[PDB]
Amino acid sequence: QLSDNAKTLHSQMMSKGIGALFTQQELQKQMGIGSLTDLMSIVQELLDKNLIKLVKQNDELKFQGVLESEAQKKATMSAEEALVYSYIEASGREGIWSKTIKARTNLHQHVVLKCLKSLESQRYVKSVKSVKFPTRKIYMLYSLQPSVDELDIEFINSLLTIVWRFISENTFPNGFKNFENGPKKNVFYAPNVKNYSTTQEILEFITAAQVANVELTPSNIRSLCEVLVYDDKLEKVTHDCYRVTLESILQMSIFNYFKMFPASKHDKEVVYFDEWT
Amino acid sequence: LNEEASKLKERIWIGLNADFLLEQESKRLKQEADIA
């Protein structure tokens, strides 16, 4: 019966529905009482009546009970979105990119646009600009904003100079660059015994905040410190331990970049690195 | 006009303009939806 087999077949879905992976053989696993066409006729009608739900994956076809809000929702939607919106809401967390829909849906761009505009007004979708290039405008359900990603853009080096302050302290006592010999006075006692770094410890120092942001993972810490290894703001000793390159001196023949300025006006005798090329 | 002319008259006006107000304040709710 439409109602009876609907409600009791909706009962296995609302109760369990064998999760997402439920196939039609899994229906016979639970209800095998239904004859081949009897169970399938009401299957087809309940999808036409937007009561059962089908997913296209792996082998056979997945099924789940409708929330009935999405049911009348897509029933209100046109035949375009009926698959298109449903096809996109099957994209899950990562959503889907526009132009690849045409090869999947076999449509123009012009025809898929206006319905995407409706779903914008319907607010069941939103344009998402992800880490990859902003020519995309990939679409996912407006209900969620998951992605794969700090934020790609700036205000990082801000906290960089912060961690460099701390680890700069961590080496010898504090800067002491006022007069000629302030360093370490041979590192307290035994300028050997002291093996020092943050690793774990930094996040305890990261607790300071004074900046609007979330927390940060220990793996990402190292990913930061490596950059300063490359810039040589600090040194990498013994795995996750670290040192500083004592270029607090550049903070401030005989060789270094800073502490040097040219004439660079008039006189025709100079040294460039170009004009050999 | 008197106060009743305002009320009942505005009652008719608003009565037929509440569809304009519908998308109006509905859009005002969409303003909150802009956060997400």
Side-chain angles (χ1 to χ4, degrees), chain A residues 113-132:
Chain A
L113 289 177
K114 60 180 67 181
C115 55
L116 293 172
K117 293 178 69 66
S118 295
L119 296 175
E120 180 179 2
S121 296
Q122 294 296 101
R123 292 173 297 180
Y124 301 104
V125 68
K126 60 178 178 295
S127 297
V128 176
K129 183 179 66 63
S130 178
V131 175
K132 186 169 63 66

mmCIF file of all heavy atoms in Angstrom, chain A residues 113-132:
data_model
loop_
_atom_site.group_PDB
_atom_site.id
_atom_site.type_symbol
_atom_site.label_atom_id
_atom_site.label_comp_id
_atom_site.label_asym_id
_atom_site.label_seq_id
_atom_site.Cartn_x
_atom_site.Cartn_y
_atom_site.Cartn_z
ATOM 1 N N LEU A 113 22.562 29.205 -15.138
ATOM 2 C CA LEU A 113 22.703 30.429 -14.363
ATOM 3 C C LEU A 113 21.440 30.825 -13.621
ATOM 4 O O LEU A 113 21.438 30.800 -12.388
ATOM 5 C CB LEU A 113 23.136 31.593 -15.258
ATOM 6 C CG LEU A 113 24.575 31.540 -15.763
ATOM 7 C CD1 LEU A 113 24.860 32.699 -16.697
ATOM 8 C CD2 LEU A 113 25.537 31.540 -14.589
ATOM 9 N N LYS A 114 20.368 31.177 -14.337
ATOM 10 C CA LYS A 114 19.190 31.752 -13.699
ATOM 11 C C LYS A 114 18.659 30.902 -12.550
ATOM 12 O O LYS A 114 18.226 31.461 -11.536
ATOM 13 C CB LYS A 114 18.091 31.995 -14.738
ATOM 14 C CG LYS A 114 17.602 30.756 -15.475
ATOM 15 C CD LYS A 114 16.507 31.111 -16.477
ATOM 16 C CE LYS A 114 17.049 31.964 -17.614
ATOM 17 N NZ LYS A 114 15.993 32.335 -18.597
ATOM 18 N N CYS A 115 18.699 29.574 -12.664
ATOM 19 C CA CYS A 115 18.253 28.758 -11.541
ATOM 20 C C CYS A 115 19.226 28.851 -10.371
ATOM 21 O O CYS A 115 18.802 28.874 -9.211
ATOM 22 C CB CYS A 115 18.048 27.306 -11.974
ATOM 23 S SG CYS A 115 19.460 26.516 -12.759
ATOM 24 N N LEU A 116 20.529 28.923 -10.647
ATOM 25 C CA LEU A 116 21.474 29.210 -9.574
ATOM 26 C C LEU A 116 21.153 30.542 -8.914
ATOM 27 O O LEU A 116 21.306 30.692 -7.697
ATOM 28 C CB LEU A 116 22.903 29.204 -10.109
ATOM 29 C CG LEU A 116 23.423 27.852 -10.589
ATOM 30 C CD1 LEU A 116 24.769 28.012 -11.264
ATOM 31 C CD2 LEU A 116 23.518 26.880 -9.432
ATOM 32 N N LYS A 117 20.698 31.519 -9.701
ATOM 33 C CA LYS A 117 20.266 32.789 -9.133
ATOM 34 C C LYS A 117 19.059 32.595 -8.228
ATOM 35 O O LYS A 117 18.964 33.221 -7.165
ATOM 36 C CB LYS A 117 19.944 33.776 -10.253
ATOM 37 C CG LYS A 117 21.150 34.210 -11.064
ATOM 38 C CD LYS A 117 20.748 35.150 -12.188
ATOM 39 C CE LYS A 117 20.281 36.491 -11.656
ATOM 40 N NZ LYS A 117 21.388 37.231 -10.992
ATOM 41 N N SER A 118 18.125 31.733 -8.634
ATOM 42 C CA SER A 118 16.986 31.429 -7.777
ATOM 43 C C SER A 118 17.444 30.827 -6.457
ATOM 44 O O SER A 118 17.079 31.320 -5.384
ATOM 45 C CB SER A 118 16.032 30.478 -8.492
ATOM 46 O OG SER A 118 15.466 31.105 -9.626
ATOM 47 N N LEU A 119 18.256 29.771 -6.518
ATOM 48 C CA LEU A 119 18.796 29.171 -5.308
ATOM 49 C C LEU A 119 19.576 30.173 -4.469
ATOM 50 O O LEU A 119 19.646 30.014 -3.246
ATOM 51 C CB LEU A 119 19.679 27.981 -5.669
ATOM 52 C CG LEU A 119 18.979 26.801 -6.337
ATOM 53 C CD1 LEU A 119 19.988 25.741 -6.744
ATOM 54 C CD2 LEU A 119 17.931 26.218 -5.407
ATOM 55 N N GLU A 120 20.164 31.194 -5.096
ATOM 56 C CA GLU A 120 20.718 32.301 -4.326
ATOM 57 C C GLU A 120 19.617 33.040 -3.582
ATOM 58 O O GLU A 120 19.719 33.261 -2.369
ATOM 59 C CB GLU A 120 21.479 33.260 -5.241
ATOM 60 C CG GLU A 120 22.085 34.444 -4.510
ATOM 61 C CD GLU A 120 22.854 35.372 -5.428
ATOM 62 O OE1 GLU A 120 22.882 35.115 -6.651
ATOM 63 O OE2 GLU A 120 23.434 36.357 -4.926
ATOM 64 N N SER A 121 18.556 33.430 -4.290
ATOM 65 C CA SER A 121 17.401 34.009 -3.618
ATOM 66 C C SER A 121 16.739 33.000 -2.693
ATOM 67 O O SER A 121 16.223 33.375 -1.635
ATOM 68 C CB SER A 121 16.402 34.530 -4.648
ATOM 69 O OG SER A 121 16.966 35.590 -5.402
ATOM 70 N N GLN A 122 16.744 31.721 -3.069
ATOM 71 C CA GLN A 122 16.268 30.681 -2.170
ATOM 72 C C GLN A 122 17.209 30.454 -0.996
ATOM 73 O O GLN A 122 16.780 29.896 0.019
ATOM 74 C CB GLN A 122 16.074 29.379 -2.943
ATOM 75 C CG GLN A 122 14.978 29.438 -3.985
ATOM 76 C CD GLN A 122 13.613 29.668 -3.371
ATOM 77 O OE1 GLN A 122 13.098 30.785 -3.374
ATOM 78 N NE2 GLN A 122 13.020 28.606 -2.837
ATOM 79 N N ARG A 123 18.472 30.866 -1.121
ATOM 80 C CA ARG A 123 19.456 30.809 -0.041
ATOM 81 C C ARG A 123 19.709 29.370 0.414
ATOM 82 O O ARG A 123 20.003 29.100 1.578
ATOM 83 C CB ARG A 123 19.033 31.690 1.137
ATOM 84 C CG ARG A 123 19.057 33.175 0.836
ATOM 85 C CD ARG A 123 18.468 33.967 1.988
ATOM 86 N NE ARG A 123 17.064 33.626 2.199
ATOM 87 C CZ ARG A 123 16.294 34.162 3.139
ATOM 88 N NH1 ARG A 123 16.786 35.072 3.969
ATOM 89 N NH2 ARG A 123 15.028 33.785 3.251
ATOM 90 N N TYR A 124 19.575 28.438 -0.526
ATOM 91 C CA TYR A 124 20.024 27.079 -0.259
ATOM 92 C C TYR A 124 21.417 26.837 -0.823
ATOM 93 O O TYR A 124 21.951 25.733 -0.667
ATOM 94 C CB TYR A 124 19.035 26.054 -0.812
ATOM 95 C CG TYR A 124 17.654 26.211 -0.227
ATOM 96 C CD1 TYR A 124 16.632 26.786 -0.964
ATOM 97 C CD2 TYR A 124 17.365 25.760 1.052
ATOM 98 C CE1 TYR A 124 15.368 26.932 -0.438
ATOM 99 C CE2 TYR A 124 16.104 25.909 1.592
ATOM 100 C CZ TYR A 124 15.106 26.488 0.840
ATOM 101 O OH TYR A 124 13.845 26.632 1.369
ATOM 102 N N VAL A 125 22.013 27.837 -1.461
ATOM 103 C CA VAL A 125 23.355 27.738 -2.015
ATOM 104 C C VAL A 125 24.041 29.069 -1.752
ATOM 105 O O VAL A 125 23.379 30.086 -1.528
ATOM 106 C CB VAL A 125 23.308 27.411 -3.526
ATOM 107 C CG1 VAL A 125 22.744 28.590 -4.289
ATOM 108 C CG2 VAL A 125 24.678 27.026 -4.057
ATOM 109 N N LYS A 126 25.369 29.060 -1.765
ATOM 110 C CA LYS A 126 26.138 30.291 -1.705
ATOM 111 C C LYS A 126 27.446 30.115 -2.461
ATOM 112 O O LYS A 126 28.059 29.044 -2.457
ATOM 113 C CB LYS A 126 26.404 30.726 -0.257
ATOM 114 C CG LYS A 126 27.180 29.731 0.580
ATOM 115 C CD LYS A 126 27.412 30.286 1.974
ATOM 116 C CE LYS A 126 28.149 29.296 2.855
ATOM 117 N NZ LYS A 126 27.329 28.079 3.109
ATOM 118 N N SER A 127 27.867 31.191 -3.118
ATOM 119 C CA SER A 127 29.129 31.232 -3.844
ATOM 120 C C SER A 127 30.253 31.188 -2.820
ATOM 121 O O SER A 127 30.285 32.000 -1.890
ATOM 122 C CB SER A 127 29.223 32.488 -4.705
ATOM 123 O OG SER A 127 28.223 32.504 -5.707
ATOM 124 N N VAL A 128 31.169 30.242 -2.984
ATOM 125 C CA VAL A 128 32.283 30.068 -2.064
ATOM 126 C C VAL A 128 33.577 30.245 -2.837
ATOM 127 O O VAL A 128 33.787 29.594 -3.868
ATOM 128 C CB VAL A 128 32.234 28.698 -1.371
ATOM 129 C CG1 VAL A 128 33.458 28.508 -0.495
ATOM 130 C CG2 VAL A 128 30.961 28.580 -0.554
ATOM 131 N N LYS A 129 34.436 31.128 -2.346
ATOM 132 C CA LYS A 129 35.744 31.365 -2.935
ATOM 133 C C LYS A 129 36.789 30.700 -2.050
ATOM 134 O O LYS A 129 37.086 31.193 -0.957
ATOM 135 C CB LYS A 129 36.001 32.864 -3.063
ATOM 136 C CG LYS A 129 37.303 33.229 -3.731
ATOM 137 C CD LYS A 129 37.434 34.739 -3.814
ATOM 138 C CE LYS A 129 37.553 35.352 -2.432
ATOM 139 N NZ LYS A 129 38.788 34.897 -1.737
ATOM 140 N N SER A 130 37.350 29.592 -2.526
ATOM 141 C CA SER A 130 38.204 28.753 -1.701
ATOM 142 C C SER A 130 39.675 29.084 -1.946
ATOM 143 O O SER A 130 40.019 30.060 -2.618
ATOM 144 C CB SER A 130 37.915 27.276 -1.963
ATOM 145 O OG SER A 130 38.770 26.451 -1.190
ATOM 146 N N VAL A 131 40.556 28.256 -1.380
ATOM 147 C CA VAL A 131 41.994 28.457 -1.507
ATOM 148 C C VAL A 131 42.418 28.505 -2.966
ATOM 149 O O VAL A 131 43.262 29.325 -3.347
ATOM 150 C CB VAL A 131 42.738 27.349 -0.739
ATOM 151 C CG1 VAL A 131 44.241 27.453 -0.954
ATOM 152 C CG2 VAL A 131 42.395 27.414 0.744
ATOM 153 N N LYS A 132 41.833 27.663 -3.811
ATOM 154 C CA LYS A 132 42.209 27.633 -5.216
ATOM 155 C C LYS A 132 41.653 28.899 -5.869
ATOM 156 O O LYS A 132 40.930 29.682 -5.246
ATOM 157 C CB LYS A 132 41.737 26.317 -5.833
ATOM 158 C CG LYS A 132 42.167 26.054 -7.265
ATOM 159 C CD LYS A 132 41.879 24.610 -7.660
ATOM 160 C CE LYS A 132 40.400 24.279 -7.624
ATOM 161 N NZ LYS A 132 39.628 25.022 -8.643
#
